[PDB]
Write a protein that binds this DNA or RNA. Sequence first.
RNA 1: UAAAGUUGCUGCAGUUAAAAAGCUCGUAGUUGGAUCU
RNA 2: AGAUACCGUCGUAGUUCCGACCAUAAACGAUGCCGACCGGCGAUGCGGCGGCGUUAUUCCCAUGACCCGCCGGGCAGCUUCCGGGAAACCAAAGUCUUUGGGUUCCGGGGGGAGUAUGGUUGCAAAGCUGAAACUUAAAGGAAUUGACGGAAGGGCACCACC
Lengths: 213, 99, 82, 132, 129, 218, 82, 71, 22
Amino acid sequence: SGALDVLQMKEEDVLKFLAAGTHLGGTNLDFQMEQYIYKRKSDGIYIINLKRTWEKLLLAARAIVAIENPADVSVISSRNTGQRAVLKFAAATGATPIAGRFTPGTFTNQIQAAFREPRLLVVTDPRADHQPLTEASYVNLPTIALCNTDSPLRYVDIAIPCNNKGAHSVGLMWWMLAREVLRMRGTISREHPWEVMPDLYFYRDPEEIEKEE
Amino acid sequence: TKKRRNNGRAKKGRGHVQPIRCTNCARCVPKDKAIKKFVIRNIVEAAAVRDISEASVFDAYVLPKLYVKLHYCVSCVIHSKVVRNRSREARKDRTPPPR
Amino acid sequence: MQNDAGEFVDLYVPRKCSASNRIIGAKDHASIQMNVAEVDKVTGRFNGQFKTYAICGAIRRMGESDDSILRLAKADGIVSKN
Amino acid sequence: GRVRTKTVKKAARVIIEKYYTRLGNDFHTNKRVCEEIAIIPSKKLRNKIAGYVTHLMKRIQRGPVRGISIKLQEEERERRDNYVPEVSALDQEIIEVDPDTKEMLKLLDFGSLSNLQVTQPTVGMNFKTPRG
Amino acid sequence: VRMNVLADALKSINNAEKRGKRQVLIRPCSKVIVRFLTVMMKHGYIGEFEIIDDHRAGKIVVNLTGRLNKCGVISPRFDVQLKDLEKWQNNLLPSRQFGFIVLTTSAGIMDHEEARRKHTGGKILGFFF
Amino acid sequence: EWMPVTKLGRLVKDMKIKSLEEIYLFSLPIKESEIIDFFLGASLKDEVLKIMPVQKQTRAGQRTRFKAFVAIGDYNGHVGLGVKCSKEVATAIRGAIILAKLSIVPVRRGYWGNKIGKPHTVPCKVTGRCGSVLVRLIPAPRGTGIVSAPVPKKLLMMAGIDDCYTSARGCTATLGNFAKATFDAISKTYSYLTPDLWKETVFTKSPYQEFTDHLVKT
Amino acid sequence: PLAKDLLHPSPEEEKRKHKKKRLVQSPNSYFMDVKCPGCYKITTVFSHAQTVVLCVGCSTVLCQPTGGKARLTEGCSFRRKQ
Amino acid sequence: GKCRGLRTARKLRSHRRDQKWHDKQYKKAHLGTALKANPFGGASHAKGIVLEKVGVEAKQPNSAIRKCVRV
Amino acid sequence: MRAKWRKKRMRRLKRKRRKMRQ
RNA sequence: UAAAGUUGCUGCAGUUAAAAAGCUCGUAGUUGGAUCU
RNA sequence: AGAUACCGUCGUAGUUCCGACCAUAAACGAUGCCGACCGGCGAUGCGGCGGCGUUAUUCCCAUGACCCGCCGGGCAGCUUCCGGGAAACCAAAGUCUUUGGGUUCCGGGGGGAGUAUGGUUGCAAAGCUGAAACUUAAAGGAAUUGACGGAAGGGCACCACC
Ligand SMILES: [Mg+2]
Ligand SMILES: [Mg+2]
Ligand SMILES: [Mg+2]
Ligand SMILES: [Mg+2]
Ligand SMILES: [Mg+2]
Ligand SMILES: [Mg+2]
Ligand SMILES: [Mg+2]
Ligand SMILES: [Mg+2]
Ligand SMILES: [Mg+2]
Ligand SMILES: [Mg+2]
Ligand SMILES: [Mg+2]
Ligand SMILES: [Mg+2]
Ligand SMILES: [Mg+2]
Ligand SMILES: [Mg+2]
Ligand SMILES: [Mg+2]
Ligand SMILES: [Mg+2]
Ligand SMILES: [Mg+2]
Ligand SMILES: [Mg+2]
Ligand SMILES: [Mg+2]
Ligand SMILES: [Mg+2]
Ligand SMILES: [Mg+2]
Ligand SMILES: [Mg+2]
Ligand SMILES: [Mg+2]
Ligand SMILES: [Mg+2]
Ligand SMILES: [Mg+2]
Ligand SMILES: [Zn+2]
């Protein structure tokens, strides 16, 4: 953010945050995530400070834009909740997606077919994407993670606090991270609303697709 | 080498626990160490339930239950297959079997 | 590094972690060197240079890398106050 | 036991991924295609490979398969995945908000939001599963 | 019971530095502790510290720069002459290029180099490098 | 002919990285021995410290394999240690040499007293540990040579240390642990925060950032 | 953790801490001005009073000792001093 | 742990000598029973009169007759 | 031989020795 | 005598390799919190 | 086969209480005591401090029973690349060759041997203290593979069974 008004959160972004339910964390708080929550509702649920989430998102975008080769960013999702969002983010920005199962040794074993050497790693859930997180610790690979209130922070360098359990919230953060990196890069203006809308990044939930058809 | 952190018993914070007797072999075993099982069973088994209900004099009598607390010494527990041996990692699980 | 004569007799000068000031060893592959692209104050666009931080493996293992990078960016003006 | 060996399965997967356009649901055309595009030194092995290719064609007909990866098929798959509703699910006339998140938004300087509807909070502080 | 407050202070700062923390609080404080922290100051190993005045015994909040490898105490506080100072620094210090032995002489509290300059021996307190 | 697979190998072969110290600066893992052969091929020597037969008991007999320990390093600034176990002794030695090349670490050398001439001894007292074996290197005056056991002496001479005092504790009869401990002590020489390294670091560009486009088109 | 200001503790967590474990120890007790239901004149009472405080201008019992804070008689009002 | 105070010299010395008595070589050299029981009486060599020639069985893993003499 | 029974046998031997040197 | 940091003041060990008294009290001994230019 | 045993029947001393001895246990956490620092998490027992909201009551404050936290002293548990360790494992068995907070006991290859002897305590049994000659290249600890088991689970076969 940098106290710049042009990079400050707007009313529309806040409304999308609240509609997606990003501020709604979990019933447990990791001690390394305490500086991101506001207070704890009487249902046991923690509320995430959305200003601070916006700041961490902007920092992650600044880290992403700082890599000259757009294909040298690796975007990983293991749960089905974030696979579509990850693929859309890769198509929009230019990163390399790994949707589905992460084969161990992708970073260490150079004989493997999928062997790659990224310069930045973005994951949807540090708990569910622990294998790439620990593999990054072998190849000097910085990591960006979407963290919940109970998300462990080992080997996580830029943590964006949010609700990474719901489909809408995960899709919304991947969509806004793409928007932020595109805006910083030079494509897309900050005044015209982005054409791509966040529902394109949402998990389709096959039983919902069947009703859709 | 130590096999179990709790030494196979549940004695923490005290010096002595009262001895009890194995229901099978009548062995003196500390109460915390002994393997205890609470059996609630129908007095009449399911095979004779129909005969008992047909030959009853009341309506909806509901057959009584039997409540027995069995205390077993480790040797008897293993021999009677009440408890089994497990792997070095499976030993740490204290969750009771689903059953 | 310096002898009495005045020249630097050393193979190389290693980097130090920007969070803990520890020397980052030659074979310590959990360490990272992040680059963060700062933005111009008018158009909100990447302008070309950046600010760089380096974190050792121990800090990352303890989970303190996130807070350390947050504070380093805050002191640099990258992250707004509060 | 009619369990196919890895020879048959890998051969069929490679054949399908390479020549998906030429194949179909017919065993007797698939076996000719296999004998034309591949070198299988046995007729029984050719028949087994063609049968598994037919089975896999039927499988891909109703969705994806973990073994196959067809480059042209992925474009159509993401085209189906490009579904966009008319109205965004995040565009709501009124969104319910707890008093605590309302206070947080006020501290954010976004307390002037109108779509927020401050719902009543919970009464009982019973959100934990009983132990035992 | 607690004896030799200096040992506790040095252990606390050593443990905080091993852990990578930027500030450490030491309690109780003492004039010996303050003099030791100041000789650590003048050589750039510690950083700025602040004394909190509780009416019983103060506390010290010490800022930490990662330049401190070890700091410890030597108990008992043996008497050191000028002749034996070389043996003591050979035993305790990691090199002749850096590291300091702290001692109380009649001239005050100072490192072994200043004690050599002033030609005074004393009692050893601790060391840091 | 060498055809690199890793990014670092491509950069090294393409005359983009000029020194091994640039790789050491960014703590990049080295996974191709041709990099070491390209940078220090002329000056590298190897020395098979030990061949040990290990045995695995089986239903019929003992299956025997051979473990080779190989120390490598030009006698100026660099050294490496490698352990490889294989069914044939020659294969084991070849693999151990490859591993020793992959494990080359830089050695920091200092002065005992006056800083006149080139560095000749360890910067300060350092310690390495590997399974009950503790090895301590102490700075020594010029011309004192290496006062150590033969096994650490080989590695210390191979690294480039001219003068050194040594103290070892534990079961040094296990050559592998002794060698790994002295290797660890040697490796710690550039991780000790001495006052001459207190100056704030100036961060440069990593090879992956300096040559992003060249890697893109190659 | 790591960079946590021990010099400037926050008031909420300073009250959260034990009385002897603060930066400067501050007692948790206080002195109250207690008004009887009928008597016009107030009495100074210790919050954690260990004695049965009697009204100096009457026979009314003002507070009863307990494990911690003393229990005021029903109707007897009180205001915190200073 | 051991005592470390400035006035603990007597305790340290007394403990060291008492524990020194638990060393096999030290006790053998300083107790005086070994020298009394030694047939040479502490000498490096001795002179004797041959009593008889004897053959001694070698220990179990190797079979041989060692030719000795009673002196 | 079990240590307990070895101690028992040694105690029997001691008892015999004490009774013999009355 | 060194090797023996296998007598350990420097400088060893005591869960399982040899090893912490069954437990507590207690004289001598040893050690002993800030504070005074 | 034998059984001076394991199984069964009877059954003395004892097992029980009081008064005097005995002072030994795998008397075990096989881990001295005092003090400081060093990660998280959820529980639990006692005491205190707060807070909606339910219950005893039917209305009054109460004070009890729950519920959500905080503090302190405990019995512990899970977790962790704190760090240690030969490892098993240990948040102490960490803050140790970067070796010093105070202080008690105590070990020094395996046997002979906790034996002989002297002393001392005890009615006794025995307790405490406690050698040497001589003998020996290992004894021992953790952990890895096999082999075996009268341990537990599965699976297979008309050279098994049905
Ligand atoms: Mg066993
Ligand atoms: Mg108790
Ligand atoms: Mg007991
Ligand atoms: Mg030694
Ligand atoms: Mg040996
Ligand atoms: Mg000697
Ligand atoms: Mg020596
Ligand atoms: Mg020893
Ligand atoms: Mg033992
Ligand atoms: Mg004990
Ligand atoms: Mg006394
Ligand atoms: Mg004093
Ligand atoms: Mg008989
Ligand atoms: Mg009987
Ligand atoms: Mg005993
Ligand atoms: Mg004992
Ligand atoms: Mg309570
Ligand atoms: Mg209350
Ligand atoms: Mg508690
Ligand atoms: Mg020590
Ligand atoms: Mg004691
Ligand atoms: Mg012995
Ligand atoms: Mg006698
Ligand atoms: Mg005794
Ligand atoms: Mg074993
Ligand atoms: Zn039994």
